[PDB]
Amino acid sequence: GSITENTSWNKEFSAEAVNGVFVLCKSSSKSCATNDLARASKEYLPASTFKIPNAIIGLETGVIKNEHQVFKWDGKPRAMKQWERDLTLRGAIQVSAVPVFQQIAREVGEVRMQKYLKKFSYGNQNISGGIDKFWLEGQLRISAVNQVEFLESLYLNKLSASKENQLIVKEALVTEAAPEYLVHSKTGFSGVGTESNPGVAWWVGWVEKETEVYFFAFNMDIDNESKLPLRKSIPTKIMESEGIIG
Amino acid sequence: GSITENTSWNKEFSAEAVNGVFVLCKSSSKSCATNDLARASKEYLPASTFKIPNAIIGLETGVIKNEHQVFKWDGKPRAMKQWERDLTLRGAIQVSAVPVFQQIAREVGEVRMQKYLKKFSYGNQNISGGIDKFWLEGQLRISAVNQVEFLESLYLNKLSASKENQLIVKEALVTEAAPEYLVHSKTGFSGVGTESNPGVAWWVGWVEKETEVYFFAFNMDIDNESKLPLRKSIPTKIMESEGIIG
Ligand SMILES: [Co+2]
Ligand SMILES: [Co+2]
């Protein structure tokens, strides 16, 4: 494949005073475009975007029984109110109920987790810092480019997991459905960090538009929760401008 | 396997002077609610709702290679401009590209087609009169209740087909995606026939709302295409009133 830097998208970033990068790749031509080649290769905490490989591994190892698996709430308090209730896989993925996936990771275990991340070529594959924390506040790091490569393998069912489990996770990732296109995506947010070293916000996934497929990965520095919506609005505006969605 | 009449839905029909039926079943098809007990089991030509079993059979027999199958347009005139282009499986289903599925049917062949419709307990299983038009103008008939049972089996991956192939068709059927739910569905429209012998319009599928699932099937007599949008608005209004979608 190839990648080229462009500038026609910069306006979307400057208008919101955002420091970030968008990587958009066209499947048929194996061609990618980005506003920042440097940042496209910089690696950041996956945060909730890790729910994608975590879900696949959970299914492949049997921790997650099947597509109809219901994650029953133990009634015990949770960081969020929307996390306090029974959830399906898609439900757990969207409200991004950390507790549910922390449990999954713990059951998967360090040896197996390490094994699949190697097979998935997932970022720096560093899971040190707590089996249930590495993707949240640990050592794991991944770039936007690596995100799209990973998502393409998932789309093509080429990851080291059953076709069935990859299919299950892909449908759970459906976020927008239109007659002409289907959007599979996942958000991520590590936190606000500081102004010196801000946290990171993500939005990655792919668009099946007509006979074409567009893989995308977006990330930005964030030191204030009020800016969260930008993780989706900026790349959405870009893809709308490209005539892919909207 | 009970069917219970519900009078709180009739208003949606009478308000539009529509003769039809809506069948809704929470959790499973063994207990369903409907506005018309008799019509709920009355069988009608499936029209394009037949694309669901046709797609599954196409995949099972290998006629449809896999999930990424592209159905190429030969450049010859098709009934709708929206059909004159290459299409993916979901693309063909969403725009209801009849010629794509007619070719799938021809390749499947009468022997295999008959075998699978028997396996799926699909309506009266009558495919006579022409392998590429039995669901369009032939003698094949299926009721709203049968549609729900068929869709339920698909949801549970209980049809006589690989889990992989059922998953492929289920994603291609996604028509609405919201944070709290996903709607899998397919429309149908036989034509307008006459006033004395009206055609039929369908909207069948299921809603995955939170940890619950609702299977539904709607059909109505129709002799004027201007009334077609009602196949969706009436059942949508009923499910919105039930607090399922919207
Ligand atoms: Co897809
Ligand atoms: Co589903």
Give the CA distances from residue A115 to residues A43, A110, A143, A146, A151, in Å, rounded to whole numbers and listed in that order.
20, 8, 20, 18, 18
Cβ-defined contact of B171 to A174 (cutoff 8 Å) = yes
Measured distance CA(B92)–CA(B106) in Å, rounded: 16
From A91, A163, A211, residue closest to B88, measured CB to CB: A211
Structure tokens at A115: 């094994």
Contacts of A174 in chain B (CB under 8 A): 171, 174, 177, 182
Distance (Å) from the C-alpha of residue A38 to the closest C-alpha of chain B?
33
| Amino acid at site B246 | G
Structure tokens at A110: 């360090």
Residues composing chain B: 246
| Amino acid at site B17 | A
**For B162, which residue in chain A has the nearest alpha carbon?**
A164
Q: By what method was this entry solved?
A: X-ray
Record the resolution, in angstroms: 2.0
- Alpha carbon of A34 to ligand 2 centroid (Å): 33
Measured distance CA(A45)–CA(A202) in Å, rounded: 10
User: Contact, A161 vs A59, CB < 8 A?
Assistant: yes
Q: Name the residue among B58, B42, B45 with its Cα closest to residue B188.
A: B45
**Looking at domain B1-246, does it have CATH number 1.20.1340.10?**
no
Place of tokens 């018309």: B36
Helical ranges in A109-228 per DSSP H: 110-119, 134-137, 144-155, 163-172
Structure tokens at B213: 């699932």
User: Contact, A113 vs A138, CB < 8 A?
Assistant: no
Q: Name the residue among B233, B178, B238 with its Cα closest to residue B208.
A: B178
**For A68, which residue in chain B has the nearest alpha carbon?**
B156
SS3 A192: coil
Mutate to test the interface with A, among B86, B94, B154, B169 (most CBs of A within 10 A): B94
Q: How many CB pairs under 8 A join A and B?
A: 69
Structure tokens at B153: 């089996």
Residues 6+ apart with CB under 8 A from A77: A84
Torsion angle defined by CA atoms of residues A10, A14, A19 and A20, in that order, rounded to the nearest 10 degrees:
-30
Q: Is the dihedral of CA B43, B48, B54, B55 positive or negative?
A: negative
Q: After which residues is chain A broken (C to N over 2.5 A)?
A: none
Residue ranges of domains in chain B: 1-246
Q: What angle do CA B102, B82, A155 make, to 5 degrees?
A: 80
Three-state helix/strand/coil letters over B118-170: HHCCCCCCCCCCCCCCCCCCCCCCEEHHHHHHHHHHHHCCCCCCCHHHHHHHH
DSSP state of A87: B
